[PDB]
Structure formats: structure tokens, C-alpha cells
């Protein structure tokens, strides 16, 4: 599931925190690297964070 960075089966604020930590350079343990590229453009960056925020805000 794209945006489920901790693979706990839901997309919520915990996933936002994990995306922010990854984009801040943190080694985030338990991170699903496959869930990071939410918009599928090959890169993990602030646009994926924005798409994650939109999922939490609107889904």
C-alpha cells in the first residue's frame, strides 16, 4: 500500500512522520522502502509527502 510506510495496514499520521524523517535523512527502522514513491515518478521527495498528506486529508 503506497503511503503505508510502516506496513500497519492504514495510512495515517504515523506514516506522515516516517516520510518526514526519511526526507530529513533519518535511518527509519521498519520503513517499507516500496511504499515511499507514492506518485511513481522514480524519486522520493516532497511531492510524495504532499500526496501522502492528501491521502490522510481526503481519503
Amino acid at each position: 500500500i503506497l503511503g503505508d510506510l510502516n506496513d500497519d495496514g492504514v495510512v495515517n499520521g504515523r506514516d506522515i512522520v516516517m516520510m518526514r524523517q526519511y526526507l530529513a535523512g533519518k535511518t527509519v527502522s521498519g520503513i517499507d522502502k516500496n511504499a515511499l514513491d507514492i506518485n511513481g515518478d522514480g524519486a522520493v521527495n516532497g511531492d510524495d509527502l504532499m500526496e501522502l498528506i492528501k491521502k490522510v486529508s481526503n481519503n
Binding site: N12, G13, V56
Partner: protein, 144 residues
């Protein structure tokens, strides 16, 4: 030492708006994440807005405060610290205001605003859960 997320108690008549405070209390460990769901009777009330108290909630220009009102009868609030260190909630206070319209058809009496105990998340800046609990509120529909 259980941190509490509490929804307030207000009254009003049909056609008016009411502002319901959501309060955090018994803060000890500084809070970096809050996820909460509040249910309400959509036949009686329409959510107009959910507004953060920016005295307590900082960095709202960078999505520290995310509101989901996509589904009638449920409000999901997500508080975060986008800086991961500088803006935790470390004191008690009002987190937000729920702005409801009392629908024209609303009948009189009490109507609960219920926090889902199962989906309540409160965590510190180190991502560890903080012992937490919720307290429900209500809107009483009255005459004018």
C-alpha cells in the same frame, strides 16, 4: 499521567453555528503526534470548519494540522510537528475548535460528540506511544 483529549459541551438553536473546543490535558511527555476521530450526528449538524488554536499548534503553514471531513458524521484530526523537534505540544490547552452548523431540521436535546477510543493515537517526538485517553462532548439543541 494519562494524557487526555477532550471534546467540549455547547448548546445552540437551529440555524446557528456552535464552536466546540477540543482540549488536551494532563500533558507530561511532549506530544509530537495526535490522530483522533470524532463522530457526530450528520442528520442534525453540518461541519463548517475545523480550526487549530495556533497559540498551541505551530507550523500550520507546513501541514502540522490536517483535517479530514470527507465523510459526513466523522471528523479526523491529525496533529504533527513538521520539524520533528521544535514544536511539540508540551502544555495543556485548546488544540482546535469544531465549527458546526445546527441544521434547520435538528430536533431538541443532547447529541454526543464521540472520540473513537480504538483509533486515538498520541505519540512523542521519539515516535513512542504516550499513555492516553479520550473524553466525549456534546451539542444540546435548544430553543432560541
Amino acid at each position: 499521567e494519562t494524557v487526555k483529549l477532550s471534546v467540549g459541551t455547547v448548546s445552540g438553536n437551529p440555524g446557528d453555528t456552535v464552536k466546540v473546543p477540543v482540549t488536551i490535558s494532563q500533558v507530561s511527555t511532549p506530544v509530537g503526534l495526535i490522530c483522533m476521530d470524532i463522530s457526530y450526528d450528520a442528520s442534525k449538524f453540518t461541519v463548517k470548519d475545523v480550526l487549530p488554536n495556533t497559540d498551541l499548534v505551530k507550523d500550520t503553514d507546513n501541514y502540522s494540522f490536517i483535517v479530514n471531513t470527507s465523510t459526513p458524521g466523522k471528523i479526523s484530526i491529525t496533529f504533527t510537528d513538521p520539524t520533528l523537534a521544535n514544536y511539540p505540544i508540551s502544555v495543556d490547552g485548546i488544540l482546535a475548535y469544531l465549527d458546526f452548523i445546527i441544521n434547520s431540521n435538528a430536533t431538541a436535546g443532547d447529541s454526543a460528540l464521540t472520540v473513537d477510543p480504538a483509533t486515538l493515537i498520541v505519540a512523542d517526538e521519539n515516535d513512542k506511544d504516550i499513555k492516553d485517553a479520550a473524553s466525549n462532548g456534546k451539542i444540546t439543541v435548544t430553543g432560541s
